[PDB]
Design a protein around this ligand. Structure first.
Ligand SMILES: c1coc(CNc2ncnc3nc[nH]c23)c1
Ligand SMILES: c1coc(CNc2ncnc3nc[nH]c23)c1
Ligand code: NA
Ligand code: NA
Lengths: 163, 163
């Protein structure tokens, strides 16, 4: 008669990094607050922690360079041993067409003999509503931005082992 | 004793386009509302006019793909005959360090025999305050984004003469 409906759209992308899983993970997750702006100087102005110690439940905030505003990451899972990290974004995420309830970003870095690692990236869009309409360019935009942050960090660390 | 101080920082960049000045201009300025999203499908979600007919005093608004918000362009000069266009952004423009009063974006497309044209891009940052501190990466970010919108449009039109 009157159902509750929700869509979960999952995009998955992978690539092989030359950098070891441990180093890429520590770069993004533990040293993000100082390395995101270094890696993405023309996009990330500032990366800071608003609440928490870095563990699950931490809230971080990225301010972007120029008139692109800013956004909070709500950290969900942090697993140093398996180089796995998950966080959600809750605000500023609607499409002109399709409201979303949240976007979940997840990566898992898996060592490959030789180092570095296979970077397994996932994004999940959660839709509110009776209805669903999501285009290829949007879905791809989210996962490409995400894998892009990770690539920029990897590249920065390769060029500055020191730090 | 107590002066009024203001800085105007101007960045200038140029490149040669294969596309003619007339076509690139008409693309960005006259057909922007439909071509910006086509040219930049992973960044510009929507480009619309909020007030005005397209002339000086028009207010347009770009909504960006993802959690990057949206921004209004206030159109200052429109010169089809000389393929020249100027607009200002007034909001969301501070650096963590340095408030700005506005950013002015200006281009002039000058035909080169052969077509297309030399794309002359300018950005001007106007600072409020007693004090001034602006880094290379920020300044470059603004002009690179700008010349980047123009390159994306040129590339789109080259690949789709039809339209
Ligand atoms: C939806 C479409 O494109 C995006 C990119 N935003 C984004 N990507 C990856 N990590 C993020 N952290 C905050 N916002 C983020 C979200
Ligand atoms: C300041 C630093 O980077 C920017 C890029 N924002 C921007 N560029 C070009 N045209 C625009 N129209 C609105 N926002 C625009 C502004
Ligand atoms: Na900003
Ligand atoms: Na958006």
């Amino acid at each position: 008669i009157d159902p509750f409906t929700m869509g979960v759209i999952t995009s998955e992308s992978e690539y092989v990094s030359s950098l070891s899983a441990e180093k890429l993970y520590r770069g993004i997750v533990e040293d993000g607050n100082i390395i995101y702006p270094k890696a993405l100087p023309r996009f990330i102005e500032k990366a800071e922690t608003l609440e928490g110690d870095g563990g699950p439940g931490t809230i971080k905030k990225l301010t972007f360079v120029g008139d692109f505003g800013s956004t909070k990451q709500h950290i969900d899972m942090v697993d140093r041993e398996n180089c796995a990290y998950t966080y959600s974004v809750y605000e500023g995420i609607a499409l002109s067409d399709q409201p979303l309830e949240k976007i979940v970003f997840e990566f898992k870095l898996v060592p490959t003999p030789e180092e570095g690692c296979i970077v397994k990236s996932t994004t999940k869009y959660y839709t509110k509503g009776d209805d669903i309409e999501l285009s290829k360019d949007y879905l791809e935009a989210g996962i490409e931005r995400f894998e892009g942050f990770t690539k920029a960090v990897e590249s920065f660390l390769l060029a500055n082992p020191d730090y």
